[PDB]
């Protein structure tokens, strides 16, 4: 939701074209009273309570809550036997068929989320293998997220990614309350 | 718009077995968008309903309503097509099983009134439908006699049960 920006808008009776004059006098015509042909009652009139402008649904959960959610996702995968640790993502070949066959043989799910430490250093073989696949998605460690972890049936991690996630998520525990945004220099925070 | 009446002539029945009564021929005809009120056409349709083709033509030839001529033309066309295409042996051996008038597509016009006011005229159009069935017209339903009427009353009496008990 927080990324959501609904671009739905409707013209209110003030924004609908025309509708300035009174359609007919109050009294004597024998018809209902009206003040403009663009009120919500009229065909082609305004919308009383419609979507208004681009609306943002942005809100931020506490970073502690989000880190705890990542932790809970990892625990759920491990407990349900969907988590698989790897020494490295290097493949013998870049053929997507090899990766699909390996996943099927090892009884992984129809969808696999492979995670590597950093984007730049991801092996060329796995890059080629996962670029051509739809249900096998390769992401950097920084890109791990609960939504993708839940969407993908199995989660494949490397040892460096495991260490990275452990450090990052455990820091939230035992960190002070911030004095200023952590992007700014701190005595011990990289 | 719907045009099922025209299609009704395209139904083909399976061949009849030798030991089966001869199926009377049925011919569906219609005229669309007649410049005539359906209410007025209904009276002519009711008049000729249930009569033989010749009797209907005779009545229509001497009725003064405008729709009479249109219905006569439709009936003549129906007779011609029944003889030519539907294998009806005799022209006179046809009777009007169905005759109804349907509303057509009408046009809206303006009628000017006395004080800048107006009404919405309707250039009324109507459809006309006929089914011609081969064979003599069915005999008119005879009025129920006193004997049958008393028989019905006695049957009603006999049907009585002891209501609301074992």
């Amino acid at each position: 939701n927080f990324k959501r920006i609904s671009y739905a808008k409707t013209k209110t009776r003030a924004e609908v074209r025309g509708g300035g004059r009174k359609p007919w006098p109050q009294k004597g015509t024998g018809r209902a009273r009206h003040g403009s042909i663009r009120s919500p009652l009229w065909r082609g009139g305004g919308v009383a309570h419609g979507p208004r402008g681009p609306t943002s649904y942005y809100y931020m959960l506490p970073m502690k809550v989000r880190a705890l959610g990542l932790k809970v996702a990892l625990t759920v995968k491990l407990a349900q036997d969907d988590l698989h640790i790897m020494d490295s993502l290097e493949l013998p070949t870049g053929d997507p068929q090899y990766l699909t066959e390996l996943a099927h043989y090892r009884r992984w799910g129809d969808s696999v989320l492979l995670v590597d430490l950093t984007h730049e250093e991801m092996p060329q073989s796995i890059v080629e293998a996962t670029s051509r696949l739809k249900t096998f998605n390769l992401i950097p460690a920084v890109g791990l997220n609960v939504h993708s972890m839940l969407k993908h049936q199995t989660l494949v991690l490397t040892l460096p990614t495991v260490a990275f996630l452990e450090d990052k998520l455990l820091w939230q525990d035992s960190r002070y309350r911030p004095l200023y945004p952590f992007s700014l220099p701190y005595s011990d925070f990289p | 718009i719907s045009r099922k009446w025209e299609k009704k002539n395209k139904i083909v029945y399976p061949p009849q077995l030798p030991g089966e009564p001869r199926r009377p021929a049925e011919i569906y005809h219609c005229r669309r968008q007649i410049k005539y009120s359906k209410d007025k056409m209904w009276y002519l349709a009711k008049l000729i309903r249930g009569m033989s083709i010749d009797q209907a033509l005779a009545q229509l030839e001497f009725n003064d309503k405008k729709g009479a001529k249109i219905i006569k033309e439709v009936l003549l066309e129906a007779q011609d097509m029944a003889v030519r295409d539907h294998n009806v042996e005799f022209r006179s051996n046809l009777y009007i099983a169905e005759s109804t008038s349907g509303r057509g597509q009408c046009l809206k016009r303006i009628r000017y009134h006395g004080r800048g006011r107006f009404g919405i005229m309707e250039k009324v159009y109507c459809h006309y439908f006929v089914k011609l069935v081969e064979g003599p017209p069915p005999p008119p339903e005879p009025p129920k006699t006193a004997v049958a009427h008393a028989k019905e009353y006695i049957q009603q009496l006999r049907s009585r049960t002891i209501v609301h008990t074992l």
Partner: peptide
């Protein structure tokens, strides 16, 4: 005061339509 409500003419296109 005299009360007069002017007649309102419906648009001509509505009644001018043709098949």
């Amino acid at each position: 005061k005299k009360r007069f409500t002017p007649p309102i003419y419906q648009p001509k296109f509505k009644t001018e339509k043709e098949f």
